[PDB]
Design a protein around this motif. Structure first.
Motif, PDB file in Angstrom:
ATOM      1  N   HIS A  87      10.307  85.873  18.055  1.00 37.40           N
ATOM      2  CA  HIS A  87      10.151  84.483  17.618  1.00 37.40           C
ATOM      3  C   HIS A  87      10.086  83.506  18.782  1.00 37.40           C
ATOM      4  CE1 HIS A  87      11.437  81.124  14.585  1.00 37.40           C
ATOM      5  NE2 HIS A  87      10.138  81.136  14.822  1.00 37.40           N
ATOM      6  N   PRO A  88       8.942  82.861  19.018  1.00 37.97           N
ATOM      7  CA  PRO A  88       8.899  81.791  20.026  1.00 37.97           C
ATOM      8  C   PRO A  88       9.775  80.599  19.676  1.00 37.97           C
ATOM      9  CG  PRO A  88       6.880  81.811  18.737  1.00 37.97           C
ATOM     10  CD  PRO A  88       7.663  83.013  18.304  1.00 37.97           C
ATOM     11  N   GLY A  94      11.728  86.375  20.477  1.00 35.72           N
ATOM     12  CA  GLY A  94      10.586  86.865  21.208  1.00 35.72           C
ATOM     13  C   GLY A  94       9.692  85.738  21.686  1.00 35.72           C
ATOM     14  N   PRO A  95       8.551  86.080  22.287  1.00 33.33           N
ATOM     15  CA  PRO A  95       7.608  85.038  22.709  1.00 33.33           C
ATOM     16  C   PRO A  95       6.523  84.743  21.683  1.00 33.33           C
ATOM     17  CG  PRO A  95       7.038  87.103  23.768  1.00 33.33           C
ATOM     18  CD  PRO A  95       8.149  87.410  22.776  1.00 33.33           C
ATOM     19  N   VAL A  96       6.337  85.636  20.712  1.00 36.50           N
ATOM     20  CA  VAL A  96       5.279  85.511  19.716  1.00 36.50           C
ATOM     21  C   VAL A  96       5.846  85.900  18.356  1.00 36.50           C
ATOM     22  CG1 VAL A  96       4.432  87.846  20.184  1.00 36.50           C
ATOM     23  CG2 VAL A  96       2.923  86.162  19.078  1.00 36.50           C
ATOM     24  N   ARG A  97       5.440  85.171  17.318  1.00 36.64           N
ATOM     25  CA  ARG A  97       5.958  85.368  15.964  1.00 36.64           C
ATOM     26  C   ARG A  97       5.170  86.479  15.285  1.00 36.64           C
ATOM     27  NH1 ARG A  97       7.348  86.663  11.590  1.00 36.64           N
ATOM     28  NH2 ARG A  97       8.587  85.420  10.120  1.00 36.64           N
ATOM     29  N   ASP A  98       5.814  87.631  15.123  1.00 35.53           N
ATOM     30  CA  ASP A  98       5.246  88.755  14.397  1.00 35.53           C
ATOM     31  C   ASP A  98       6.373  89.529  13.723  1.00 35.53           C
ATOM     32  OD1 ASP A  98       3.662  90.704  13.326  1.00 35.53           O
ATOM     33  OD2 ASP A  98       2.858  91.442  15.230  1.00 35.53           O
ATOM     34  N   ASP A  99       6.090  90.039  12.523  1.00 39.99           N
ATOM     35  CA  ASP A  99       7.137  90.676  11.729  1.00 39.99           C
ATOM     36  C   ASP A  99       7.588  91.997  12.345  1.00 39.99           C
ATOM     37  OD1 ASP A  99       4.892  92.187  11.223  1.00 39.99           O
ATOM     38  OD2 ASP A  99       5.118  92.193   9.042  1.00 39.99           O
ATOM     39  N   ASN A 100       6.639  92.836  12.767  1.00 34.71           N
ATOM     40  CA  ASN A 100       7.006  94.130  13.336  1.00 34.71           C
ATOM     41  C   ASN A 100       7.615  93.978  14.725  1.00 34.71           C
ATOM     42  OD1 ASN A 100       4.739  93.484  14.847  1.00 34.71           O
ATOM     43  ND2 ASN A 100       3.412  94.966  13.810  1.00 34.71           N
ATOM     44  N   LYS A 101       7.131  93.007  15.504  1.00 39.73           N
ATOM     45  CA  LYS A 101       7.676  92.792  16.843  1.00 39.73           C
ATOM     46  C   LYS A 101       9.127  92.344  16.781  1.00 39.73           C
ATOM     47  CE  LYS A 101       3.816  93.654  19.033  1.00 39.73           C
ATOM     48  NZ  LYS A 101       3.056  92.584  19.741  1.00 39.73           N
ATOM     49  N   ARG A 102       9.523  91.719  15.670  1.00 40.57           N
ATOM     50  CA  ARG A 102      10.863  91.161  15.511  1.00 40.57           C
ATOM     51  C   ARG A 102      11.121  90.132  16.611  1.00 40.57           C
ATOM     52  NH1 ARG A 102      15.213  93.314  12.596  1.00 40.57           N
ATOM     53  NH2 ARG A 102      16.752  91.645  12.297  1.00 40.57           N
ATOM     54  N   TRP A 108      17.028  86.652  12.000  1.00 39.63           N
ATOM     55  CA  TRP A 108      15.745  86.910  12.621  1.00 39.63           C
ATOM     56  C   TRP A 108      15.919  86.863  14.140  1.00 39.63           C
ATOM     57  CZ3 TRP A 108      11.279  88.860  12.804  1.00 39.63           C
ATOM     58  CH2 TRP A 108      10.196  88.262  13.455  1.00 39.63           C
ATOM     59  N   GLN A 109      15.060  87.585  14.864  1.00 32.60           N
ATOM     60  CA  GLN A 109      15.322  87.889  16.266  1.00 32.60           C
ATOM     61  C   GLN A 109      14.282  87.272  17.198  1.00 32.60           C
ATOM     62  OE1 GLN A 109      18.270  89.272  17.008  1.00 32.60           O
ATOM     63  NE2 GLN A 109      18.557  89.269  14.780  1.00 32.60           N
TER      64      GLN A 109
END
Length: 48
Positions: free
Chosen positions: A46-47, A36-44, A33-34
């Motif tokens: 993860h904060p 990011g700043p916000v947890r969303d499936d399409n955004k890929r 899993w990749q």
């Protein structure tokens, strides 16, 4: 809630508590899993 924590218990076990949330972040990593700043499936993303 009534349970109290002796020294050899949580009072010095909090370090492995941190090591274990680190265990979940690593298991997410080998789940692939990749970041990011916000947890969303399409955004890929993860904060955590």
């Amino acid at each position: 809630s009534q349970i109290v924590l002796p020294p050899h218990l949580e009072r010095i076990r909090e370090k492995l508590a941190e090591n274990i949330h680190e265990l979940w972040v690593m298991n997410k990593i080998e789940l692939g899993w990749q970041y990011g700043p916000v947890r969303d499936d399409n955004k890929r993303q993860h904060p955590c």
